[PDB]
Design a protein around this ligand. Structure first.
Ligand SMILES: *[C@@H]1O[C@H](CO[C@@H]2O[C@@H](C)[C@@H](O)[C@@H](O)[C@@H]2O)[C@@H](O[C@@H]2O[C@H](CO)[C@@H](O[C@@H]3O[C@H](CO[C@H]4O[C@H](CO)[C@@H](O)[C@H](O)[C@@H]4O[C@@H]4O[C@H](CO)[C@@H](O)[C@H](O)[C@H]4NC(C)=O)[C@@H](O)[C@H](O[C@H]4O[C@H](CO)[C@@H](O)[C@H](O)[C@@H]4O)[C@@H]3O)[C@H](O)[C@H]2NC(C)=O)[C@H](O)[C@H]1NC(C)=O
Ligand SMILES: *[C@@H]1O[C@H](CO[C@@H]2O[C@@H](C)[C@@H](O)[C@@H](O)[C@@H]2O)[C@@H](O[C@@H]2O[C@H](CO)[C@@H](O[C@@H]3O[C@H](CO[C@H]4O[C@H](CO)[C@@H](O)[C@H](O)[C@@H]4O[C@@H]4O[C@H](CO)[C@@H](O)[C@H](O)[C@H]4NC(C)=O)[C@@H](O)[C@H](O[C@H]4O[C@H](CO)[C@@H](O)[C@H](O)[C@@H]4O)[C@@H]3O)[C@H](O)[C@H]2NC(C)=O)[C@H](O)[C@H]1NC(C)=O
Lengths: 13, 209, 210, 13
């Protein structure tokens, strides 16, 4: 899964 | 003496977002007009690296120059604890100055994020305070922000990290909103970025009932 | 050396706020040489020379220097009114005397608003809980924040330093950590705050399980 | 009235 912050990519596992 | 060296880490948000590029900065101050030539040697865990870039030279207006070398780091390399060394050589230095930086050592710890609503006594004013307690995290490198309905809420102030009695850190972020916004049932989220969180990110929300 | 260096310190906020305490201004002189250990102190309260300071015992620092200290007792009201305390240090190793000044931060004092916030529901699964005390809208930043329960001090807390707010006032948060069982027992915990702008320089706000 | 902190006098008005 991926984490997004205000439409910007944070990180994926 | 001669020049002075200051070596800076990347910005926490830059090491935590794959969409950003972190960098280590080696700042040389008190570089003389007579000897402006500065030699930079960079080491990542003692291994000499050749891809740093020198920033344009700046006159400081106190008869000195500010000479800067920037080294781009890999996110995982910084988060793994690699030591970045800057070796500065200049004619005015008796011997080269070597400075080091790396992430704070210690087993990283996951932050526990808690949003606390305003007090009953806070609800009789023009504006209310929404709190975000961020605790039990290690190292102190963190990014804390606020949003509502997909838009950033910029009327906040975050306390610097405080060293807790268990060796971890804590901080509080305070968002100030108009009383009516809160009373109308609007959702306010506290976003937190830290290496020890799943995908370096967590968001905690807060609303009236 | 390059001669002595002077550091001038204000009284402890709790000492200026409690009538049962004695506040004092401290003039510290470092890098005093063994060849010229003699230090002359001149003290001024709003330019008016005062003669009741006392010199603390001379201390050897073990780096071939002495630490010479003069302490001036201040009146609570004088410090809170904004009087400037000046220390003038004279020594043979100084080309001219060093003069340093201290006083309370200028600006209209503002009353702190004290709010106790109970632990978040998500934290009520852990061995310990966090009790918060939000202290906001105060000016100057000089404050004392403590915690008690059942008339006894609760010492397992950490207070954040004051943060400058967008309106020119300050805020901080104090966090008390208690075992969850102690919160579940119905024990009442209080947040005592001391500030010049509070009625009687004191306020206490409580919280218990609801 | 008077304010007390842990049995110690703070201030009186
Ligand atoms: C000639 O001029 C130089 C340039 O200064 C400017 O111009 C002069 C004329 C005046 O107008 C100045 O006011 C103006 O700033 C002077 O350089 C300064 O030298 C001193 C040392 O003598 C440096 O101090 C050190 O600063 C570290 C922190 O520095 C960051 O923060 C500063 C603001 O808070 C900022 O100004 C700096 O640029 C720097 O910023 C960071 O840069 C990196 C990379 O660019 C970024 O990624 C970060 O985001 C930036 N962060 C911020 C906050 O912006 C301190 O860490 C350091 O302290 C430590 O060491 C000392 C000594 O060991 C300890 O005492 C201390 O306790 C601590 O351990 C130290 O204070 C200062 O940064 C220099 N300024 C600049 C702009 O480089 C020269 O001194 C001057 N020469 C003479 C002879 O007059
Ligand atoms: C010889 O030895 C002295 C050191 O004493 C001890 O023994 C030596 C050998 C070592 O073991 C030391 O580690 C040890 O300290 C040196 O004296 C020190 O000189 C420096 C300046 O060169 C002083 O620094 C200044 O400190 C101010 C704050 O000082 C308070 O806090 C210190 C701890 O953080 C504490 O050590 C001090 O005693 C002092 O404590 C306060 O005292 C008052 C009155 O007693 C109390 O009311 C308070 O509650 C106390 N507060 C606390 C926290 O307990 C800073 O304000 C100041 O900074 C400002 O100025 C500088 C310079 O302009 C700026 O760079 C800076 O940004 C800022 O604007 C400064 O750092 C230091 O305090 C001295 N230590 C003592 C004990 O007096 C001699 O220098 C050394 N000689 C040589 C030649 O080596």
């Amino acid at each position: 899964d991926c984490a997004w912050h205000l439409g910007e990519l944070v990180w994926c596992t | 003496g001669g020049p002075s060296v200051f070596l800076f880490p990347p910005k926490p948000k830059d090491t935590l977002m794959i969409s950003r590029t972190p960098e280590v900065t080696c700042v040389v101050v008190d570089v003389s007009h007579e000897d402006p030539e500065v030699k930079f040697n960079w080491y990542v865990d003692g291994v000499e690296v050749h891809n740093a870039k020198t920033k344009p030279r700046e006159e400081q207006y106190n008869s000195t120059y500010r000479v800067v070398s920037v080294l781009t780091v890999l996110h995982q390399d910084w988060l793994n604890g690699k030591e970045y060394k800057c070796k500065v050589s200049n004619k005015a230095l008796p011997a080269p100055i070597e400075k080091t930086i790396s992430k704070a050592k210690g087993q990283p710890r996951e932050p526990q994020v808690y949003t606390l609503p305003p007090s009953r006594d806070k609800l009789t004013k023009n504006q209310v305070s929404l709190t975000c307690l961020v605790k039990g995290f290690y190292p102190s490198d963190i990014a804390v922000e606020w949003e509502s309905n997909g838009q950033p809420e910029n009327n906040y102030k975050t306390t610097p990290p405080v060293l807790d009695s268990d060796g971890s850190f804590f901080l509080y972020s305070r968002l100030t909103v108009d009383k009516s916004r809160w009373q109308q049932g609007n959702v306010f989220s506290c976003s937190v970025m830290h290496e020890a969180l799943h995908n370096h990110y967590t968001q905690k929300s807060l609303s009236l009932s």
